[PDB]
Amino acid sequence: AAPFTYWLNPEIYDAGGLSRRAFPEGFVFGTAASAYQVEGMAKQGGRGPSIWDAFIEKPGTIPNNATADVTVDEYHRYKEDVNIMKNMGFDAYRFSISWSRIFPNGTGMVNQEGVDYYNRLIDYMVKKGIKPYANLYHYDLPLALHEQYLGWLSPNIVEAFADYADFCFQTFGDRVKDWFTFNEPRCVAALGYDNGFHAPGRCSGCDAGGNSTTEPYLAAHHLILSHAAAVKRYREKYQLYQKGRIGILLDFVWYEPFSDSNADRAAAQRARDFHLGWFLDPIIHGRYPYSMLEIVKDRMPTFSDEESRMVKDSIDYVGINHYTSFYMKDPGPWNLTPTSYQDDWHVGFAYERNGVPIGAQANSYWLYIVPWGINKAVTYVKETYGNPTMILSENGMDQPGNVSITQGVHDTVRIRYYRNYITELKKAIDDGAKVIGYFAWSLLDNFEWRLGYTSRFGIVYVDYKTLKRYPKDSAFWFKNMLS
Numbered sequence: 001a002a003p004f005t006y007w008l009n010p011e012i013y014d015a016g017g018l019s020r021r022a023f024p025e026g027f028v029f030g031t032a033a034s035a036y037q038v039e040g041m042a043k044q045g046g047r048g049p050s051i052w053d054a055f056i057e058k059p060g061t062i063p064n065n066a067t068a069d070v071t072v073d074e075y076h077r078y079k080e081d082v083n084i085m086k087n088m089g090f091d092a093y094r095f096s097i098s099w100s101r102i103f104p105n106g107t108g109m110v111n112q113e114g115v116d117y118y119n120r121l122i123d124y125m126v127k128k129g130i131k132p133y134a135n136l137y138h139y140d141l142p143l144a145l146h147e148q149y150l151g152w153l154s155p156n157i158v159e160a161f162a163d164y165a166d167f168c169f170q171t172f173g174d175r176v177k178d179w180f181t182f183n184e185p186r187c188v189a190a191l192g193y194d195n196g197f198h199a200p201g202r203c204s205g206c207d208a209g210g211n212s213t214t215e216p217y218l219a220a221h222h223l224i225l226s227h228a229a230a231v232k233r234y235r236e237k238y239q240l241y242q243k244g245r246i247g248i249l250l251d252f253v254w255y256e257p258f259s260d261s262n263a264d265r266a267a268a269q270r271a272r273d274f275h276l277g278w279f280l281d282p283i284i285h286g287r288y289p290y291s292m293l294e295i296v297k298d299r300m301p302t303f304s305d306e307e308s309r310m311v312k313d314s315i316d317y318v319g320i321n322h323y324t325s326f327y328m329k330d331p332g333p334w335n336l337t338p339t340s341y342q343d344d345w346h347v348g349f350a351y352e353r354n355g356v357p358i359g360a361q362a363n364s365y366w367l368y369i370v371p372w373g374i375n376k377a378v379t380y381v382k383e384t385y386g387n388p389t390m391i392l393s394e395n396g397m398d399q400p401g402n403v404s405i406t407q408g409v410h411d412t413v414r415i416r417y418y419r420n421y422i423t424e425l426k427k428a429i430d431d432g433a434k435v436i437g438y439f440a441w442s443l444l445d446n447f448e449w450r451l452g453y454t455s456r457f458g459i460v461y462v463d464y465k466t467l468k469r470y471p472k473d474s475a476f477w478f479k480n481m482l483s
């Protein structure tokens with residue numbers, strides 16, 4: 001590469017006073033990824049198609065009709081990837097297992113070739129001293145199940161998921177001691193079924209059809225039951241023998257009141273309710289948020305008594321995926337007519353106060369750089385939910401995809417991002433938050449869902465022509481801070 005690639009960035013060596021000794025004994029630092037975003041071999045090695053394979057087929061879905069058939073090809077270059085992880089000082093890797101790579105049809109026939117891949121992967125991490133954190137679901141429902149009964153929209157999914165979970169616990173649990181059932185069921189439900197932005201692209205006006213007033217609530221409900229059903233398998237059959245732990249990964253945008261009024265304060269709490277409460281209130285309290293029940297009414301399913309008991313306390317810890325924050329305003333008087341889950345929040349978003357933007361915007365349209373947001377979010381979870389064990393399970397930011405190696409590696413904006421967010425995380429911990437780990441999204445630039453390869457989130461740059469890896473300055477910033 002060009003000489004400027006090798007300029008030594010002084011920011012690499014400013015850890016902002018952070019080290020392992022600024023965190024609890026045993027605190028875990030890792031990176032996070034997902035099966036579809038990094039594996040490749042989408043249509044090979046036995047893997048049956050998922051909803052994203054079909055979704056991607058519609059022209060104009062991914063920019064430049066790009067695909068994840070290869071992406072960064074972690075399927076073949078996992079040893080290199082794990083080696084970078086170890087060399088940069090990380091303790092852990094949160095990956096996901098692909099459901100349809102294990103069960104090409106979602107239920108029934110096991111794909112032994114898929115099982116073999118995950119065994120290779122996990123065994124290699126253990127060999128190198130990287131702790132495996134396995135996530136069971138990251139947007140990749142087997143297409144068959146969507147075809148049979150529309151996947152998350154059917155109560156049939158619950159036992160289908162629990163069986164897949166069961167198999168994974170049986171198969172991988174001798175060395176995986178850290179499980180998550182779902183990555184961000186709120187996005188699975190909202191992007192899948194409210195605005196159709198993600199697979200299977202259902203919504204009120206969408207080509208695929210759908211109903212934004214009802215389907216996201218149906219989906220969310222079945223995701224919760226599926227989580228609880230899977231955890232029940234874990235607890236009853238595996239937990240006391242494998243001695244591991246199981247949680248869920250929940251996204252949480254911080255919602256800050258725009259002003260001190262009762263109205264704006266209530267708006268911010270209302271947003272938290274619909275964004276996080278939706279899943280965390282059932283799991284901690286066995287019930288939905290009050291605001292949701294009153295606003296959404298008949299459109300929300302209800303839990304039976306049995307269901308409520310299965311759902312309550314169905315985690316050993318909660319993963320919080322946190323990136324960004326917004327101001328929240330009371331939007332005036334509310335219609336009235338059901339329109340969508342997002343509309344049901346009855347809030348106004350604001351991105352600046354007194355001419356000052358809440359923060360700089362990263363590449364992604366939704367990502368505003370607001371480090372103090374991570375402190376408020378974690379503290380809120382501490383105060384609202386009885387100080388549960390937490391993992392800060394995703395955090396990072398993106399550069400535009402169209403940049404050269406030479407430019408891509410000097411990501412001092414990302415160094416600032418981490419220094420500042422990790423610093424604000426430390427404060428919330430120092431103040432009592434029971435956070436036991438932190439994971440950066442992501443090790444490698446990868447397939448960014450609807451943004452394709454126009455968004456680079458990695459701390460390692462990937463040349464998509466050659467699949468060669470180039471650690472960015474931020475990787476070295478971690479390496480330095482972690483020793």
Ligand SMILES: OC[C@@H]1[C@@H](O)[C@H](O)[C@@H](O)c2[nH]cc[n+]21
Pocket residue numbers: 034037183184251321323364394441448449457
């Ligand atoms: O947008 C960057 C990343 C995605 O790539 C991940 O798959 C997803 O877990 C997520 N949630 C919030 C931000 N992100």
